[PDB]
Design a protein around this ligand. Sequence first.
Ligand SMILES: *c1nc(Cl)c(C#N)nc1CC
Ligand SMILES: [Zn+2]
Length: 197
Amino acid sequence: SSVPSQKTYQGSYGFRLGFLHSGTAKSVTCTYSPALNKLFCQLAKTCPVQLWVDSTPPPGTRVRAMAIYKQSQHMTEVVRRCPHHERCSDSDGLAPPQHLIRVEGNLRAEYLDDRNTFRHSVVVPCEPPEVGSDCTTIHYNYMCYSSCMGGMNRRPILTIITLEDSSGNLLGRDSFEVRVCACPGRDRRTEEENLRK
Ligand SMILES: *c1nc(Cl)c(C#N)nc1CC
Ligand SMILES: [Zn+2]
């Protein structure tokens, strides 16, 4: 399958992602490393991602998330849930069982299987920030471990977040690496130390 672009693109509205500061304690279920541009999270736990713009985009603007393999030799392979987790009875009534990435708590989420590339993606309407806030937050879930055999099989993935108009044309793009693992704080601390050394 052809490979979606991963080029960071702020666009006319100054679109970019943001992450909370969660730390590396034993209790953390989701933690973001700015040094690695990498999110570490437990299976099917809430991953809050902030969405920032300098200017308000038009009504009908949408936000899409899609995963690709990071390594060049695997980028053409569609990222999907492994044979075990795709058969889990963990449906929410909206997400197809094969999709790695879900949006939590948005009844207007739409899930696409692309007719030409076969890649999966989930898209929601882009909303203005709430009354007390300066950004919008979307909650994602990753429904397979990075280590799952017959799925990601220990290969790193990127999540690509695209801001789109009502036809799906590109308005902005950002991305981050993801590891889905049982000990996200410990793995973050280790991978950050490897980078320093
Ligand atoms: C999405 N959509 C709108 Cl209208 C706004 C505003 N204001 N912000 C987002 C998140 C990038
Ligand atoms: Zn799995």
